[PDB]
Design a protein around this ligand. Structure first.
Ligand code: NA
Ligand code: NA
Ligand code: NA
Ligand code: NA
Length: 124
């Protein structure tokens, strides 16, 4: 399945704790063509865009905001996983996953050391 769409958030669990264990309502637009992705995430006041291909390193930021090199792999046909490494600093191990349900929900998880936050999106 293909992750393209305009995605609205419907659930969120542990965002502040991801935030509270770390230092410190986004809409998401995805275009996927094969293994190539564009993901734009925005709130009312902030926006960011990433471009990556599965299996190719790229640069982005950690939950707490620090510069990182990322690499995405497929865990299955419906789920991708991303390992991150800070470009400069020491820190918690951070990563994220995105997967699609058969019903077309997009589930994001974000992990910072042992704390996991889950966000769920549907297409609008
Ligand atoms: Na903190
Ligand atoms: Na970030
Ligand atoms: Na952040
Ligand atoms: Na980290």
């Amino acid at each position: 399945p293909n992750f393209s769409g305009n995605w609205k958030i419907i659930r969120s669990e542990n965002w502040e704790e991801l935030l509270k264990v770390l230092g410190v309502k986004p809409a998401v637009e995805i275009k996927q063509e094969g293994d190539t992705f564009y993901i734009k995430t925005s709130t009312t006041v902030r926006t960011t865009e990433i471009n990556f291909k599965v299996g190719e390193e790229f640069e982005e930021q950690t939950v707490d905001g620090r510069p990182c090199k990322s690499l995405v792999k497929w865990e299955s046909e419906n789920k991708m996983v991303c390992e991150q490494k800070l470009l400069k600093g020491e820190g918690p191990k951070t990563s994220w996953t995105r997967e699609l349900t058969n019903d077309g929900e997009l589930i994001l998880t974000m992990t910072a050391d042992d704390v996991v936050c889950t966000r769920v999106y549907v297409r609008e």
